[PDB]
């Protein structure tokens, strides 16, 4: 039962990220945090499979995905900062001017 | 007759004039540029014709290999 | 050892040149002595030069790109298909850069880092085209995406640009996570990430009753990421907002190059791999949805940029019809549609960038253009009629294959939808022609004439659009060649 | 059982990430999730990844999030909303994902039911692979820089993009 | 009598080299 | 590190040297290689000069353009010379020099 | 008004060229990139008219 | 939340995971019946295909 | 095409992997005992 238990752990993390997207319509910072949660779940999926399959490819890609997660968070938080600086607020009603 | 050099030269001259017109300039504002454009158009057209011949030559061999691979099924 | 790296000479050169330009720009932009000169145009010219030298290196070394293929096999795969894809990508990047100089100097956008980010994204898309493993594909996609996120927000004091960036980063990161999940499921189910291994494992079984639900959902999630990238409905709504809110040169660049790169990826993943009818049905349903929604939403638009965004969504629906029918002619038609759509989009955005010098925003702002600049109004009209697909303009090729694929595969509903959406598209395209030629507004907007770069690019793309169907043989042959090279 | 404990901690901490009213609290719970993940990694024998998750996710990424969220001083009125009306939409979407995606491995990877017999005696030991055992660290380092070096370098390019973007978007030099 | 802008002179030499080298490139190919 | 120069598409001309050394490839540079090299470098220097005038850095811009052109032109000449020695490009001169030394 | 017109009409070739270049340089702006650089570009005094001729 | 609230949520989650374990055992125990159903349906489909090909 | 995976371009691993078969990290453990 080990492999099903390790996989459902990562799976609950992924579903939690999805739920965080669904439940945070006024809070886009938490939406970013939910996306990181999904990325963490995928990283865990690669590591578990590497062990289960006795193969190193899952481990190389896990490290590279960590690099991508870091760069993603850096750029995303920069964009958050400049949006806040322009508006003085992070409320979603001030980032809805592009439409139609 | 109607050679690739002549079509290309006409297209290059037309390109310079069209460019001048788009910029609301007289058709023949910088005539040496018209000469340059005729030269480049002629060169381009001749190279396109040669490339087309070469492309058909490569497609022929590649279709031949595809046909052979398909015909291997009925062996 | 050194000769092994002949397979990556183009990429080595462009990366090194990008580093050189980064150093040059940062050293002299900070110079008190030189009074902090703007370097966006200087670096832009040097980067256009670098792109052209990269193109020369790649085009002239066609066999050498396949050298040491066993040594490079677990990293990438270069062939005839990647050859032509990468050439077309470099040509598009060069054109987009050439269209940016008036924007640099008249707006005074002095940031040279814009050019560096464009060059790094071009590096990423080059590696995307040659990717032959899920890991490499993901890494190259992410490099490309991060560069776009940054450049979409380049007007960092603008509400519109910051909004575009924020929406792009959130939705892009979400879709990338979904795609990565799919990749993890496929690895866990097959023990493989290399495309050759995946082809061997998946071929001959598709859904033979005992189907790997892990393999089936990995494919689905990867397809969702791909569809987000090509702005296919229902994963499209990021595209109109990002296209409108980004700086117009960014919008022009995003409209062309990523499509080339991601379709290269889609061909080599799906077409070269094997789950099968399910995925072609995915692209089938998304094509129909994209055509319908693009047509209707474009009909609703009053602004030029949003109209072009929705037009591109509809056209990717038309293109994906070719991927769906799963034949050599389908792939060829998809490639022909990408080439022609790219040259038409370059023409349209050259006009839009020319008009942005007087801040064109609304379709109604084009009023009386046939009076204030007759040859410009005609040129823009040719682009619109080509977008509408009126023969014998180049745009007629996509309409012709859309109906060619429906009638043969037996798809009468697709033909129905194509007829309706083509007529709707023609209406909203000729509305622009009516605005420039038929209307008599009380207040006119007089536009500043365009620079030489855009006039020359417009002149060449306008001859191509009018005259392509007189001599279409090279494109037809080159695209048949590429379609065949995917499997042989 | 131990995986039940760690998964329960992760479940609760993740719910706190997505449901805490204060975003600073969300960042702190996120840190608890990464700690639990590191515990799982230690169970898998991947001590390098277990430590790196602490160093990078908690030591660098979460610190960045905390610095940014703390200086924002977000008022709850700007991000508050009632979530009772989402229970149905989360119920279908969660259930469908639950029914499909927690059980995706079951048909391919059928669990071994633990029997009332000592199967431990059927574990076969090969001493040949135990003469010179490799750490997780050296197994990874045997591959990153030689056979897959191109992906390594592309990741470097990604980090360079991050640095450039961070400067260009936020810098206001005094 | 003399053009004094050294950088301009170097650029002139570079343009001349480009033109002549292009002619030679065409001729010997 | 195991290496394998073997290409996917075989050489269509006689193989003078399967994996020529760096210095051998450079010493194999012909007059046409030097013409390509010099043309690319000269164009690059010219572009650097002309694009540098408006910011006021035409000299340093010339140097930067020249560095880019030098690297690109050398890579192009090396590409051609190595491809000739390997039989991927028409190599009449290489074959003639090989059949004699 | 006579003062500004007399000043402009009496300028030499060299000063005309200098002011043409200065006018072109300061015709547009990118204050956001200047703030990134931490500099403030000031209009040169040869392009500023006296206050007694300004509308206010 | 209260510390006791977090602890109680953790207990509820532990119960949920043990229930999930029971579910996995159930799914494993029914592999044979699912295989039998798949085989019977495959036989039916093959017989129908062979019979319709007779015409 | 019929048997496209048979085409030499697709058998890259079958020809590369034997060249690295003696590389530390992918050897059979008994190879070290006998070499
Ligand atoms: C015999 C031994 C006896 C001695 C030992 C006894 C030890 C004591 C008992 C242990 C502790 C229990 C009591 C808890 C504290 C109560 C006292 C108190 O003052 O609470 C105040 C509390 C007020 O909240 P607060 O802490 O002050 O925070 C205020 C703000 O929210 C703060 O703001 P914030 O930003 O920090 O947080 C935002 C938000 C945070 O938002 C949330 O946390 C979400 C709230 C809903 C939680 C939904 C479930 C989460 C748990 C996971 C369960 C599995 C989920 C699976 C889903 C994925 C599947 C697809 O806040 C809230 O919404 C608070 C809501 C709290 C409600 C918690 C209800 C938990 C669900 C219980 C379900 C019971 C079902 C049983 C079977 C379960 C199925 C197996 O009000 C309550 O009384 C609720 C707590 C009481 C119920 C929770 C504990 C349940 C434990 C049940 C016993 C275990 C049964 C299983 C045993 C298994 C054995 C094998
Ligand atoms: C063999 C094992 C034996 C174990 C024996 C120990 C068993 C302990 C059982 C305890 C359960 C029964 C409790 C009965 C009631 C006790 C009476 C009472 O509550 O009065 C206490 C009273 C507050 O009680 P309260 O009336 O409920 O007020 C609650 C809030 O005020 C309410 O205000 P609020 O509604 O606004 O909420 C705001 C929020 C505040 O915002 C937050 O975010 C809370 C903080 C959570 C994240 C903070 C850590 C991340 C930040 C980075 C820290 C550095 C990271 C690196 C260093 C640590 C990593 C190793 O407050 C909370 O949410 C508190 C929830 C606590 C969740 C975190 C603790 C669980 C950690 C996991 C423990 C794992 C083992 C236990 C489970 C075992 C399996 C069942 O004052 C104190 O707690 C004293 C403060 C000292 C606490 C030190 C705790 C450790 C802190 C340092 C370590 C940080 C990492 C945590 C461990 C990580 C492990 C890797
Ligand atoms: C620096 C900062 C500070 C913070 C921090 O870092 C950062 O600090 C860091 C510090 C970290 C902790 C560090 C350490 C641990 C311990 C670990 O826990 C070990 C658990 C493992 C080891 O457990 C046993 O392992 C051996 C047995 O396996 C025992 O050997 C015997 O048996 C040998 C064989 O006969 C004999 O030869 C030997 O002679 C004989 O002695 C050995 O004694 C014993 O240890 C795994 O075990 C389980 O796994 C089994 C498999 O799943 C489960 O089996 C079950 O399922 C099977 C079906 O699947 C059924 O068949 C089975 O019937 C059925 O039972 C079962 O649940 C259970 O066994 C749990 C994680 C944790 C807490 C870390 C958390 C995170 C931190 C706090 C980090 C934290 C973040
Ligand atoms: C049959 C095709 C299918 C149907 C589509 C038709 C699309 C067009 C719609 C037809 C309705 C009427 C269209 C009226 C357009 C005719 C008027 C026109 O375009 O004249 C242009 C002419 O536009 C052009 O410049 C067209 C140039 C295209 C060149 C194509 C020819 C290529 C080879 C020619 C070689 C050079 C000339 C040889 C002889 C000297 C004048 O432009 P202005 O904006 O008025 O002024 C330009 C500025 N200036 C005069 C000062 C230079
Ligand atoms: C008596 C019979 C001989 C007649 C000879 C006629 C041949 C003339 C052929 C026409 C050539 C056209 C070349 C077009 C390029 C224009 C070159 C140029 O403009 O020179 C510039 C720039 O020169 C360069 O940077 C490189 C190009 C020069 C190389 C070509 C020079 C053409 C004549 C050759 C003179 C050199 C020969 C001797 C060399 C030792 C001088 O420097 P700046 O004043 O700072 O430039 C300002 C910006 N703007 C370009 C707009 C003027
Ligand atoms: C053989 C016929 C074609 C030959 C063309 C020249 C040789 C090819 C070299 C490349 C030519 C490319 C086109 C050069 C002009 C490009 C656009 C430049 C326009 C520009 O904005 O900058 C001008 C620089 O002038 C310039 O760039 C031109 C500088 C002098 C070149 C003109 C002489 C051409 C010789 C033609 C035949 C001569 C017969 C005797 C040999 C400054 O513009 P401005 O202030 O100077 O004035 C303009 C009055 N609107
Ligand atoms: C964009 C606008 C199009 C440009 C206008 C037309 C270009 C014509 C220039 C070529 C003329 C002379 C070519 C010289 C030549 O044959 O040498 C080859 C260079 O090919 C080349 O120069 C290849 C040019 C390829 C053009 C772009 C093709 C795009 C394909 C459309 C697909 C788009 C969808 C992507 C998802 C290399 O020699 P070789 O023949 O040995 O090398 C391939 C062996 N296999
Ligand atoms: C008015 C009368 C017609 C109304 C619509 C008829 C719907 C039924 C058509 C149908 O059976 O659709 C099948 C699937 O096509 C499809 O692609 C499914 C229907 C279209 C789905 C995508 C479009 C949804 C709407 C998008 C805009 C609105 C957005 C939401 C507000 C066609 O069968 P086939 O063509 O596969 O047969 C291939 C044979 N060789
Ligand atoms: C196929 C259908 C038929 C096509 C017809 C083919 C005929 C060939 C074309 C002939 C051209 C005729 C004109 C030639 C003479 C003009 C020479 C240009 C002068 C020049 O140096 O231009 C500079 C600007 O560069 C420029 O303006 C050059 C850049 C122009 C953009 C085009 C190249 C971009 C890269 C490739 C794009 C590919 C896209 C395809 C996907 C400086 O100009 P200035 O001195 O006036 O000062 C502008 C203010 N800064
Ligand atoms: C490629 C591998 C590594 C990649 C990354 C590192 C690349 C190296 C760093 C490149 C960054 C750009 C360096 C720019 C140096 C400019 C020097 C300078 O101030 O020049 C002014 C300095 C003095 O002139 P002034 O500006 O008039 O005072 O030098 C020149 O302008 C010399 C001009 C004649 C050069 C023509 C020949 C050029 C051929 C190529 C060399």
Coordinates of N, CA and C in Angstrom, one line a residue, chain F residues 16-94:
Chain F
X16 N 37.6 13.6 -45.6 CA 39.1 13.8 -45.5 C 39.5 13.5 -44.0
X17 N 38.7 14.0 -43.1 CA 39.0 13.8 -41.7 C 37.6 13.7 -40.9
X18 N 37.4 12.6 -40.3 CA 36.1 12.4 -39.6 C 35.8 13.4 -38.5
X19 N 36.8 13.6 -37.7 CA 36.6 14.5 -36.5 C 37.9 15.4 -36.4
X20 N 38.0 16.4 -37.3 CA 39.2 17.2 -37.4 C 39.4 18.0 -36.1
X21 N 40.7 18.1 -35.7 CA 41.0 18.9 -34.6 C 40.7 20.4 -34.8
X22 N 40.6 21.1 -33.7 CA 40.3 22.6 -33.8 C 41.3 23.3 -34.7
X23 N 42.6 23.1 -34.3 CA 43.7 23.8 -35.0 C 43.8 23.4 -36.5
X24 N 43.5 22.1 -36.8 CA 43.4 21.6 -38.1 C 42.3 22.3 -38.9
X25 N 41.1 22.5 -38.3 CA 40.0 23.2 -39.0 C 40.4 24.6 -39.2
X26 N 41.0 25.3 -38.3 CA 41.4 26.7 -38.5 C 42.5 26.8 -39.5
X27 N 43.5 26.0 -39.5 CA 44.5 26.0 -40.6 C 43.9 25.6 -41.9
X28 N 42.7 25.0 -42.0 CA 42.1 24.6 -43.2 C 41.3 25.8 -43.8
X29 N 41.3 27.0 -43.1 CA 40.5 28.1 -43.7 C 41.1 28.5 -45.0
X30 N 40.1 28.7 -46.0 CA 40.5 29.0 -47.3 C 40.3 30.5 -47.5
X31 N 40.5 31.0 -48.7 CA 40.3 32.4 -49.0 C 38.8 32.8 -48.9
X32 N 37.9 31.9 -49.3 CA 36.5 32.2 -49.2 C 36.0 32.2 -47.8
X33 N 36.6 31.4 -46.9 CA 36.3 31.4 -45.5 C 36.7 32.8 -44.9
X34 N 37.9 33.3 -45.3 CA 38.4 34.6 -44.8 C 37.5 35.7 -45.3
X35 N 37.0 35.5 -46.6 CA 36.1 36.5 -47.1 C 34.8 36.6 -46.3
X36 N 34.2 35.4 -46.0 CA 33.0 35.4 -45.2 C 33.2 36.0 -43.9
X37 N 34.4 35.6 -43.2 CA 34.7 36.2 -41.9 C 34.8 37.7 -41.9
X38 N 35.6 38.2 -42.9 CA 35.8 39.6 -43.0 C 34.5 40.4 -43.3
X39 N 33.7 39.9 -44.2 CA 32.5 40.5 -44.5 C 31.5 40.6 -43.3
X40 N 31.4 39.5 -42.6 CA 30.5 39.5 -41.4 C 31.0 40.5 -40.4
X41 N 32.3 40.5 -40.1 CA 32.8 41.4 -39.2 C 32.7 42.9 -39.6
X42 N 32.9 43.2 -40.9 CA 32.8 44.5 -41.4 C 31.4 45.0 -41.3
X43 N 30.4 44.2 -41.7 CA 29.0 44.6 -41.6 C 28.6 44.9 -40.1
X44 N 29.1 44.0 -39.2 CA 28.8 44.2 -37.8 C 29.4 45.5 -37.3
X45 N 30.6 45.8 -37.6 CA 31.2 47.0 -37.2 C 30.4 48.2 -37.7
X46 N 30.0 48.2 -39.0 CA 29.3 49.3 -39.6 C 27.9 49.5 -38.9
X47 N 27.2 48.4 -38.6 CA 26.0 48.5 -37.8 C 26.2 49.1 -36.5
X48 N 27.2 48.6 -35.8 CA 27.6 49.2 -34.5 C 27.8 50.7 -34.5
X49 N 28.6 51.1 -35.5 CA 28.8 52.6 -35.7 C 27.6 53.3 -35.9
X50 N 26.8 52.9 -36.9 CA 25.6 53.7 -37.3 C 24.5 53.7 -36.2
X51 N 24.3 52.6 -35.5 CA 23.3 52.6 -34.5 C 23.8 53.3 -33.2
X52 N 25.1 53.5 -33.1 CA 25.7 54.2 -31.9 C 25.7 55.7 -31.9
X53 N 25.4 56.3 -33.1 CA 25.5 57.7 -33.2 C 24.5 58.4 -32.4
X54 N 23.2 58.0 -32.4 CA 22.2 58.7 -31.7 C 22.4 58.7 -30.2
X55 N 22.7 57.6 -29.5 CA 23.1 57.6 -28.1 C 24.4 58.4 -27.8
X56 N 25.3 58.6 -28.8 CA 26.5 59.2 -28.6 C 27.7 58.3 -28.2
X57 N 27.6 57.0 -28.5 CA 28.6 56.0 -28.1 C 29.1 55.2 -29.3
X58 N 29.2 55.9 -30.5 CA 29.5 55.2 -31.7 C 30.8 54.4 -31.7
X59 N 31.8 54.8 -30.9 CA 33.0 54.1 -30.8 C 32.8 52.8 -30.0
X60 N 32.3 52.8 -28.8 CA 32.0 51.6 -28.0 C 31.0 50.7 -28.7
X61 N 30.0 51.3 -29.4 CA 29.0 50.6 -30.2 C 29.7 49.8 -31.3
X62 N 30.7 50.5 -32.0 CA 31.5 49.8 -33.0 C 32.2 48.6 -32.4
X63 N 32.8 48.8 -31.2 CA 33.5 47.7 -30.6 C 32.6 46.5 -30.3
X64 N 31.4 46.8 -29.7 CA 30.5 45.8 -29.4 C 30.0 45.0 -30.7
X65 N 29.6 45.8 -31.7 CA 29.2 45.2 -32.9 C 30.4 44.3 -33.5
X66 N 31.6 44.8 -33.4 CA 32.7 44.1 -33.9 C 33.0 42.8 -33.2
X67 N 32.8 42.8 -31.9 CA 32.9 41.6 -31.1 C 31.9 40.5 -31.6
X68 N 30.6 41.0 -31.7 CA 29.6 40.1 -32.2 C 29.9 39.6 -33.6
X69 N 30.4 40.4 -34.5 CA 30.7 40.0 -35.8 C 31.9 39.1 -35.9
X70 N 32.9 39.4 -35.0 CA 34.1 38.5 -35.0 C 33.7 37.1 -34.6
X71 N 32.9 37.0 -33.5 CA 32.5 35.7 -33.0 C 31.6 35.0 -34.1
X72 N 30.6 35.7 -34.6 CA 29.8 35.0 -35.6 C 30.5 34.6 -36.9
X73 N 31.4 35.5 -37.4 CA 32.2 35.2 -38.6 C 33.1 34.1 -38.4
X74 N 33.8 34.0 -37.2 CA 34.7 32.9 -37.0 C 33.9 31.6 -36.9
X75 N 32.7 31.6 -36.2 CA 31.9 30.4 -36.1 C 31.5 30.0 -37.5
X76 N 31.1 30.9 -38.4 CA 30.7 30.6 -39.7 C 31.8 30.0 -40.6
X77 N 33.0 30.6 -40.5 CA 34.2 30.0 -41.2 C 34.5 28.7 -40.7
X78 N 34.5 28.5 -39.4 CA 34.8 27.2 -38.8 C 33.8 26.1 -39.2
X79 N 32.5 26.5 -39.2 CA 31.4 25.6 -39.7 C 31.8 25.1 -41.1
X80 N 32.1 26.1 -42.0 CA 32.3 25.7 -43.4 C 33.6 24.8 -43.5
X81 N 34.7 25.2 -42.9 CA 35.9 24.4 -43.0 C 35.8 23.0 -42.4
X82 N 35.2 22.9 -41.3 CA 34.9 21.6 -40.7 C 34.0 20.7 -41.5
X83 N 32.9 21.4 -42.0 CA 32.0 20.6 -42.9 C 32.7 20.1 -44.1
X84 N 33.6 20.9 -44.7 CA 34.4 20.5 -45.9 C 35.3 19.3 -45.5
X85 N 36.0 19.4 -44.4 CA 36.9 18.3 -44.0 C 36.1 17.0 -43.7
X86 N 34.9 17.2 -43.2 CA 34.1 16.0 -42.8 C 33.3 15.4 -44.0
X87 N 33.3 16.1 -45.1 CA 32.6 15.6 -46.3 C 31.1 16.0 -46.4
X88 N 30.7 16.9 -45.5 CA 29.3 17.4 -45.5 C 29.1 18.5 -46.6
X89 N 30.1 19.2 -46.9 CA 30.1 20.3 -47.9 C 31.0 19.9 -49.1
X90 N 30.8 20.5 -50.3 CA 31.7 20.3 -51.4 C 33.1 20.6 -51.0
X91 N 34.0 19.7 -51.2 CA 35.4 19.8 -50.6 C 36.5 19.4 -51.6
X92 N 36.4 19.9 -52.8 CA 37.3 19.6 -53.9 C 38.8 20.0 -53.4
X93 N 38.9 21.1 -52.8 CA 40.2 21.6 -52.4 C 40.8 20.6 -51.3
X94 N 39.9 20.3 -50.3 CA 40.4 19.4 -49.3 C 40.8 18.0 -49.8

